[PDB]
RNA sequence: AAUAUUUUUGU
RNA sequence: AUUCUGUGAUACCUAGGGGACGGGUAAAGGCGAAGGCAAUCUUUUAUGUAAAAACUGACGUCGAAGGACGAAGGCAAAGGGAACAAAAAGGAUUAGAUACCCCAGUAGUCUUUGCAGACAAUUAUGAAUGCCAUAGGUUAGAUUUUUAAUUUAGUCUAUAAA
């Protein structure tokens, strides 16, 4: 600011303020949702030990297929009920 | 080639901004360049406090300069800026893809609009 | 006027609670071991709950529930104490200091690349 | 930019011919204070454009 | 963003747990009792209203099991049509 | 005045359950008022088309814009996935690179939005300050 | 030359199905919902019917017979076929009453569609030989372009910056040669004017000097130039120096084929009371109360703004079935995007009570019992 | 008339969920001690 | 003819770059005149010493989409003039 | 969700 | 447990340095002869792909040998040395434990100039040409009645004839 400068640090981006329609408990739920949407807890675990480029690559291929298979499965489950609703 | 330099200097003196913009400006024209525009941005916070030459800075005086000079001039322009202890940091970039059709639509540095390319 | 801070650092094996002033100077810097836990019980959820209650209790003895008008709760790490201490501040133990909270931030340290980490372990 | 002295000069001669200040429709209605002024203003502006375009199209200012 | 993939040929298109797993409600009341003792105390009066709720929970009769979900049957009808086929 | 105030709260509560903004010309049927339609099972407010193609701009040439970069990075400073931006792989690679150029050039933060943008957002007077400590 | 088998298919009924027209235009730079879609502004698929004798069997003239569960029981048999045979080997269909009955409701209001009016009400019909015309000739000048409604060129102010670039480069740039010829035809006519006028008391005009020079004379007057470019590309006029081009031309017919009535200047003769003053009211729902700076109401399936004035002030959960108020539809028009906007105007009191007399809802009947 | 029967069913769903959310708001904070 | 269409498109780019040569700077005389005019201690409404005061913020995505979704309101009149010109400049090539 | 005591042999 | 700490540690800050690393984006994605290549700016370098036109006119494919390139580790010389870590060394586990685990830790990893030429250097499938029926995704383009369908060159699943 004019006299005191803002503390620009990684925690500055991970900050949620208390307002009239957002109490303390409401700021925690907003934080947890944002801390999990950015996969912070996942980064701490992966950065605990080193994963060579080949293991980090093959690990993504395994997790990327399970994500595509799970997505295409929910689409077939909801497509089944969309057809079951038409009487098919 | 169409270049663009975003220089950040100390917020203390406004005269220091003129001498820097003029030194690099005359340098471009003497070599044979064509300055397209020079926007004077004010003094606002930096991405983070960075210390240069045993001096902690929290906000520098920004300024953009879009010129069309040769490679030798560009390197010489951004090399003198770096050596100058009055600049906090610089951001040089090559504008456009190199084609004439796109290089002819670069004018004033926009702030409330985009560079439609 | 920067608010007071209530840093809560917690990892797999211990938890630290530091209460600083606007200038970031520690006032109450305690850990689980300060209560009597020895080498294994500093990780338990219960120990982190007693530490939070002990720290908050010490804040009342120092008359900080009337001296602090604005406070910030900073969280670093995902250990068991991340939820234990929060529930203390979100219960009856921390009802006096709850009204003065204005911010809630996270200060977990991550590296974009950074220094090489230890090799994986083979426990099996 | 895949140009040459011929194409360059043609564009200049064309650009200046389509931007020349159109004179008044009639002579009695013409105003020498404005017509002669635009002639000098446009002429000076043309010299600047030519001097600026010649530097942009200079092949010595290109890359490998 | 890409759309859901067409699942490969599977042996059977089904969901492991068709009907949701019901959580014992009294386990949640016990957690509240253990919370009072942690903060208030064991031989206190603040846990009175909470301890009584724990006794009333274990006394009440458990609900009846819900009718099983027929999702897996409809998934088996549209498997060969939704996926690439059946494999065995 | 008590009944008047309590009625307002209960009224606004129901207004929150009508997850639909009726517009002029929108055709509605008796089914468009049932819970299934109002429940809003859709959990995604995704974009329609590639904004970089509708606005016809080159991201790489607009690295100066500090608001354009803060719009394509999460509050944590992480580039947004194509699911959120809803861009094509080519345009996503252009915006992803424009963010790295600006951050790499040192003109934009890498872990949060630009400070000057944090001054205009909520919590203006509650931003973390730096005490001189001396 | 077509075989007899190929000649019957051409005239068959299933081959007459119209292609699925694009959905009603929406904001390109906006967010929408993917896993859920509500009713559209106007229909995009053809609504089908079948004989009551064929409905008991599921035969709708499609690839396969439809199921009887979701197809029988309703009064009006309507269905929309999104795909006659999908990758699941099933006719992807859905009930079409969402738009089939909405047309019957609107047509029950007995109101025509009139051209939009800027704010002396002048309700002019849409189907008229002067305005409703799509064919034209190169002789009609700008003064007649205000009548047309179907233009070949796009609305510049509506197109996005990217859609405008594609137009300039791939539709406008490769037309200079043909446009220069367009000027020559005009210059050829100008030279004939003086010749004709002088004879009472054409030249080929192929010369690049006149064309190139003719354009240099219009640089000072850019207005007359735009009128010439628009005529070559068939653009919708934007600047007044008029045809309600503020929001742009319509993406369809001004009526959208929903109501073909031309005038509302009639008086329904009531049996007992006689010719009434205004048209019978219509009950309307109350959606999105003010406490949004405007209230929405559902009039015959459509959503329109409430009358310029309770039920509109605050929400009332106690009111069973929701707040419903009687109202009169004053004017109806189709905007550029294709929406059907209604100018719902508050209704009178006597009309409502009169409309209920034939229903049995009026508390005190107006006939006989009414002493004054 | 059909909209009434559907609007009523929505009202039942709204009041049920609204009341349900109140429990979530009160369950966030802890008051089991009954101070 | 195909080689003429390319040269023609190459010419238009030079005429465009010719019209934008009014704001360029070719000699030191225009340089010092430009610096002394824009670089002053009281140029950004001073109060405030930042471009974030006169022009509060740079155009964002929210604002951009609002120009084509929110409003569509009088910016069309200022935009149409700039668009109609671009259409005429393309066909006629006059670069008005 | 990121948890991990030990446990050999068989003409 | 060895170990760190009252010579004030951990925790929370301030101000100066110092090295190597590369978060998100990120995908069945892409690029090169392979090996292999993922922060960023400027400079620099050879192929390849799409669309049309124009040009040369069989100038093509494979290719022993020679030569060039060739991962990590390693040798040689001079730098650098935060982190990780063969070796050496200690603490535990265990019937025993060089081991797996732990406290610390040198070469080495990085830079520059050479040597070295072995790899599950893999698609366990040499390179190349002609040819054989479909479908569902996906990558970079092209065309269009750019809504959505054709189409060129790749890549990946599931099939027909075989
Ligand atoms: K110290
Ligand atoms: K390739
Ligand atoms: K170590
Ligand atoms: K060698
Ligand atoms: K394919
Ligand atoms: Mg301690
Ligand atoms: Mg180790
Ligand atoms: Mg073991
Ligand atoms: Mg044996
Ligand atoms: Mg460094
Ligand atoms: Mg490889
Ligand atoms: Mg990465
Ligand atoms: Mg060969
Ligand atoms: Mg060989
Ligand atoms: Mg080596
Ligand atoms: Mg080496
Ligand atoms: Mg050595
Ligand atoms: Mg040992
Ligand atoms: Mg190396
Ligand atoms: Mg290898
Ligand atoms: Mg070979
Ligand atoms: Mg691939
Ligand atoms: Mg296969």
**Nearest CA among B93, F67, B8, F99 for reference residue I55:** F67
Torsion of CA A67, A72, A74, A77, to 10 degrees: -150
Q: Which residue of G has its CA nearest to E81?
A: G88
Q: Report yes or no: B64 and B3 within 8 Å, Cβ to Cβ.
A: no
Q: Report yes or no: G365 and G357 within 8 Å, Cβ to Cβ.
A: yes
Question: Nearest Cβ partner of F37 from G38, G298, G302?
Answer: G38
Q: Report yes or no: G77 and G56 within 8 Å, Cβ to Cβ.
A: no
Cα dihedral sign, D35-D36-D38-D43: positive
Interchain pair H8, G298: CB under 8 A:
no
Determine the length of chain I.
96
- The full DSSP string for D5-49 is HHHHHHHHHHHHHHSS-PPPSSSTT--HHHHHHHHHHHHHHHHHH
d(CA A43, ligand 20 centre) in Å: 29
F126 touches chain C (CB under 8 A): yes
CA atoms within a 13 Å half-sphere pointing along the CA-CB vector of G269: 1
Alpha helices in chain C (DSSP H): 45-61, 81-89, 95-98
Scanning the structure block, which residue is given the tokens 């405008």? Answer: G164
Tokens of G358: 């034939």
Chains touching chain C at 3 or more Cβ pairs under 8 angstroms?
A, E, F, H
Q: Pick the residue of H5, H6, H9 with the most F CBs within 10 A to test the interface with F by mutation.
A: H6
Q: How far is the CA of F104 from the C1' of K109 (A)?
A: 26
Is the distance between the Cβ of C116 and the closest atom of strand K smaller than 7 Å?
yes
Which residues face G343 on adjacent strands?
G331
Q: How far is the CA of G300 from the C1' of K67 (A)?
A: 87
Q: How far is I42 from chain G (nearest CA, A)?
A: 36
Spatial distance between the Cα atoms of I34 and I50, rounded to a whole number of angstroms: 19
3-state secondary structure of G52: helix
Spatial distance between the Cα atoms of G264 and G123, rounded to a whole number of angstroms: 9
Tokens of A56: 């980090």
Spatial distance between the Cα atoms of E6 and B25, rounded to a whole number of angstroms: 61
Spatial distance between the Cα atoms of G197 and G275, rounded to a whole number of angstroms: 61
Tokens of E13: 């298109």
Q: Which residue of H has its CA nearest to C87?
A: H30
Tokens of G305: 């703004």
Determine the length of chain G.
372
CA end-to-end span of chain E: 33
Strand J contacts in C 8-47 (CB under 7 A): 12
Q: Taking CB atoms and an 8 Å cutoff, what residues of chain A touch E4?
A: 71-72, 74-76
Spatial distance between the Cα atoms of G248 and G159, rounded to a whole number of angstroms: 11
Q: Report yes or no: G242 and G146 within 8 Å, Cβ to Cβ.
A: yes
A20 touches chain F (CB under 8 A): no
Q: Which helix (H) or strand (E) holds E31?
A: helix E25-39
Per-residue 3-state assignment (H helix, E strand, C coil) for G175-210: HHHHHHHHHHHHHHHHHHHHHHHHHHCCCCCCCHHH
Per-residue 3-state assignment (H helix, E strand, C coil) for chain F: CHHHHHHHHHHHHHHHHCCCCCCCCCECCHHHHCHHHHCCCCCCCCECCCHHHHCCCCHHHCCCCHHHHHCCECCCCCECCHHHHCCCHHHHHHHHHHHHHHHHHCCCCCCCCCHHHHCCCCCHHHCCECCCCC
Q: What is the DSSP letter of G159?
A: S
Contact exists between G and E (3 or more beta carbon pairs < 8 Å):
yes
Neighbouring residues of C68: CB distance < 8 A, sequence distance ≥ 6: C3, C4, C97, C100
Which residues face B2 on adjacent strands?
B68
D17: exposed, middle or buried (Cβ count in 10 Å: 0-12, 13-18, 19+): exposed
Q: Report yes or no: D57 and D3 within 8 Å, Cβ to Cβ.
A: yes
Count residue pairs from A and F with Cβ separation < 8 A: 57
Resolution (A): 3.0
CA end-to-end span of chain D: 13
Hey, which residues 54-93 in chain C have their CB within 8 Å of chain E?
87-88, 91-93
**Nearest CA among B85, B107, B87 for reference residue B96:** B107
Contact exists between H and I (3 or more beta carbon pairs < 8 Å):
no
Q: How far is the CA of A57 from the C1' of K70 (A)?
A: 23
C26 touches chain A (CB under 8 A): no
Spatial distance between the Cα atoms of G88 and G106, rounded to a whole number of angstroms: 37
Tokens of B37: 């525009």
Contact exists between C and D (3 or more beta carbon pairs < 8 Å):
no
Is the distance between the Cβ of C122 and the closest atom of strand J smaller than 7 Å?
no
Q: What is the DSSP letter of G14?
A: G
Is the distance between the Cβ of A45 and the closest atom of strand J smaller than 7 Å?
yes
Is the distance between the Cβ of A62 and the closest atom of strand J smaller than 7 Å?
no
Interchain pair G94, A86: CB under 8 A:
yes
Quote the distance between the C-alpha of residue G49 and its chain's center: 25
Spatial distance between the Cα atoms of E37 and C75, rounded to a whole number of angstroms: 26
Scanning the structure block, which residue is given the tokens 């005061």? Answer: I53
Neighbouring residues of D49: CB distance < 8 A, sequence distance ≥ 6: D12, D15, I18, I21, I22
E65 touches chain F (CB under 8 A): no
Interchain pair D11, I21: CB under 8 A:
no
Strand K contacts in F 29-88 (CB under 7 A): 73-74, 76-82, 88
Q: Taking CB atoms and an 8 Å cutoff, what residues of chain D touch B66?
A: none
**Nearest CA among B38, B33, B49, B52 for reference residue B7:** B38
Q: What was the elucidation method?
A: cryo-EM
d(CA G88, ligand 22 centre) in Å: 30
Q: How far is H11 from chain A (nearest CA, A)?
A: 24
CA atoms within a 13 Å half-sphere pointing along the CA-CB vector of I21: 27
Torsion of CA G7, G8, G14, G19, to 10 degrees: 10
């Amino acid at each position: 600011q004019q006299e005191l400068n803002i503390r620009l640090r990684p925690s500055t981006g991970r900050t949620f303020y208390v307002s009239g329609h957002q109490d303390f408990a409401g700021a925690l739920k907003l934080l947890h949702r944002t801390v999990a949407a950015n996969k912070v807890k996942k980064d701490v675990r992966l950065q605990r030990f080193h994963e060579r480029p080949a293991l980090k690559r093959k690990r993504n291929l395994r997790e990327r297929w399970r994500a595509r298979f799970k997505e295409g499965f929910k689409a077939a489950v909801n497509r089944t009920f969309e057809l079951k609703n038409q009487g098919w | 080639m169409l270049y663009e330099t975003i220089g950040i200097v100390r917020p203390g003196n406004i005269a220091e901004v003129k001498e820097l913009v003029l030194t690099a400006g005359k340098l471009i024209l003497n070599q044979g360049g064509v300055i397209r525009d020079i926007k004077n941005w004010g003094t606002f916070l930096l991405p983070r406090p960075i210390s240069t030459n045993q001096q902690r800075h929290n906000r520098g005086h920004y300024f953009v300069m879009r010129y069309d000079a040769s490679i030798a001039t560009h390197e010489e322009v951004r090399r003198t800026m770096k050596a100058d202890p009055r600049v906090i940091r610089t951001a040089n970039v090559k504008l456009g893809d190199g084609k004439l059709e796109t290089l002819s639509r670069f004018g004033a540095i926009p702030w409330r609009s985009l560079e439609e390319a | 006027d920067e608010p007071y801070h209530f840093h809560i650092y917690s990892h797999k094996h211990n938890t630290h609670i530091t209460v600083t002033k606007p200038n970031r100077d520690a006032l109450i810097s305690l850990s689980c071991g300060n209560l009597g836990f020895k080498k294994s019980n500093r990780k338990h959820y219960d120990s982190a709950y007693q530490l939070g209650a002990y720290v908050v209790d010490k804040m009342h003895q120092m008359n900080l529930h009337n001296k602090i008008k604005k406070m910030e709760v900073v969280l670093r790490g995902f250990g068991p104490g991340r939820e234990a201490v929060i529930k203390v501040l979100l219960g009856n133990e921390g009802r006096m200091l709850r009204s003065s909270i204005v911010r809630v931030s996270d200060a977990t340290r991550l590296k974009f690349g950074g220094t090489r980490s230890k090799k994986p372990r083979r426990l099996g | 930019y895949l140009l040459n002295k011929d194409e360059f000069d043609s564009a200049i001669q064309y650009a200046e011919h389509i931007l020349k200040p159109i004179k008044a429709e009639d002579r009695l209605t013409a105003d020498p204070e404005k017509e002669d002024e635009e002639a000098r203003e446009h002429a000076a502006r043309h010299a600047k454009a030519v001097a600026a375009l010649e530097r942009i199209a200079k092949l010595e200012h290109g890359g490998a | 963003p890409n759309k859901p993939i067409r699942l490969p040929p599977l042996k059977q298109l089904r969901v492991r747990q068709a009907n949701k797993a019901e959580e014992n409600p009294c386990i949640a009341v016990m957690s509240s009792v253990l919370a009072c003792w942690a903060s208030a105390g064991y031989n206190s009066a603040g846990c009175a209203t909470v301890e009584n709720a724990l006794r009333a929970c274990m006394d009440a009769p458990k609900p009846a099991p819900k009718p099983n979900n027929t999702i897996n049957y409809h998934l088996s009808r549209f498997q060969e049509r939704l996926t690439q086929g059946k494999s065995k | 005045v008590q009944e008047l105030l309590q009625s307002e709260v209960t009224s606004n509560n129901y207004m929150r359950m009508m997850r639909r903004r009726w517009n002029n010309g929108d055709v509605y049927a008796p089914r468009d008022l049932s819970p299934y339609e109002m429940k809003g099972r859709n959990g995604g407010w995704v974009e329609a088309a590639d904004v970089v193609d509708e606005l016809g701009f080159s991201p790489l040439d607009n690295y100066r814009n500090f608001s354009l970069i803060s719009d394509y990075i999460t509050p944590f400073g992480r580039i947004r996935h194509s699911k959120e931006t809803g861009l094509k792989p080519v345009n996503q690679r252009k915006i992803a690179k424009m963010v790295r150029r600006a951050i790499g050039l040192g003109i934009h933060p890498s872990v949060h939005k630009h400070p000057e943008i944090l001054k205009n957002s909520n919590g203006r007077h509650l931003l973390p300050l730096v005490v001189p400590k001396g | 030359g077509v075989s007899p088998g190929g000649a019957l298919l051409r005239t068959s009924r299933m081959f007459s199905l119209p292609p699925v027209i694009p959905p009603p235009p929406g904001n390109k730079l906006q967010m929408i919902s993917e896993r859920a879609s509500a009713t559209e502004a106007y229909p995009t698929h053809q609504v089908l019917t079948t004989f009551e004798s064929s409905r008991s069997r599921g035969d709708w003239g499609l690839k396969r017979p439809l199921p009887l569960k979701s197809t029988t029981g309703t009064t009006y048999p309507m269905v929309k076929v999104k795909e006659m045979d999908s990758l699941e080997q099933i006719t992807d269909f859905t009930s079409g009453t969402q738009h089939g009955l909405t047309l019957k409701k609107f047509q029950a209001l007995n109101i025509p569609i009139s051209t939009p009016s800027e704010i002396r009400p002048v309700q002019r019909s849409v189907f008229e030989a002067d305005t409703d015309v799509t064919a034209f000739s190169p002789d009609e000048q700008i003064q007649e372009a205000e009548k047309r409604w179907k233009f070949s060129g796009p609305w510049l102010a509506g197109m996005t910056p990217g859609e405008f670039k594609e137009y300039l480069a791939k539709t406008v740039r490769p037309k200079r040669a043909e446009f220069r010829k367009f000027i020559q035809k005009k210059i050829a006519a100008q030279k004939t004017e003086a010749a004709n006028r002088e004879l009472q008391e054409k030249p080929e005009s192929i010369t690049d000097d006149e064309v190139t020079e003719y354009l240099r004379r219009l640089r000072n007057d850019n207005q007359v130039l735009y009128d010439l470019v628009g005529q070559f590309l068939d653009l919708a006029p934007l600047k007044p120096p008029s045809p309600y081009g503020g929001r742009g031309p319509p993406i369809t017919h001004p009526s959208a084929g929903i109501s073909y009535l031309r005038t509302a200047a009639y008086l329904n003769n009531h049996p007992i009371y006689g010719p009434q003053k205004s048209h019978p009211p219509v009950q309307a729902r109350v959606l999105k109360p003010r406490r949004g700076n405007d209230a929405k109401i559902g009039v015959a399936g459509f959503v329109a703004d409430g009358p310029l004035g309770s039920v509109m002030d605050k929400f009332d959960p106690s009111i069973e079935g929701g707040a419903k108020l009687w109202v009169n539809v004053d004017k109806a028009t189709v905007d550029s995007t294709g929406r059907v906007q209604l100018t719902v105007s508050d209704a009178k009191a006597t009309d409502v009570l009169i409309a209920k007399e034939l229903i049995g809802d009026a508390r005190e009947p107006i006939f006989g019992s009414a002493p004054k | 008339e059909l909209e009434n029967k559907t609007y009523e069913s929505w009202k039942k769903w709204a009041t049920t969920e609204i009341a349900r959310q109140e429990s979530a708001r009160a369950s966030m904070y802890t008051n089991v001690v009954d101070n | 003819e195909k080689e003429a269409m390319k040269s023609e498109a190459r010419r238009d780019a030079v005429v465009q770059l010719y019209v934008a040569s009014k704001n360029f700077i070719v000699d030191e005389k225009e340089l010092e005149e430009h610096v002394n005019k824009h670089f002053t201690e009281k140029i950004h409404n001073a109060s405030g010493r930042s471009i974030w005061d006169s022009q509060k913020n740079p155009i964002s995505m929210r604002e951009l989409r609002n120009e084509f979704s929110g409003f569509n309101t009088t910016s069309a009149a200022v935009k149409t003039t700039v668009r109609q010109k671009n259409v005429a400049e393309e066909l006629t090539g006059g670069k008005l």
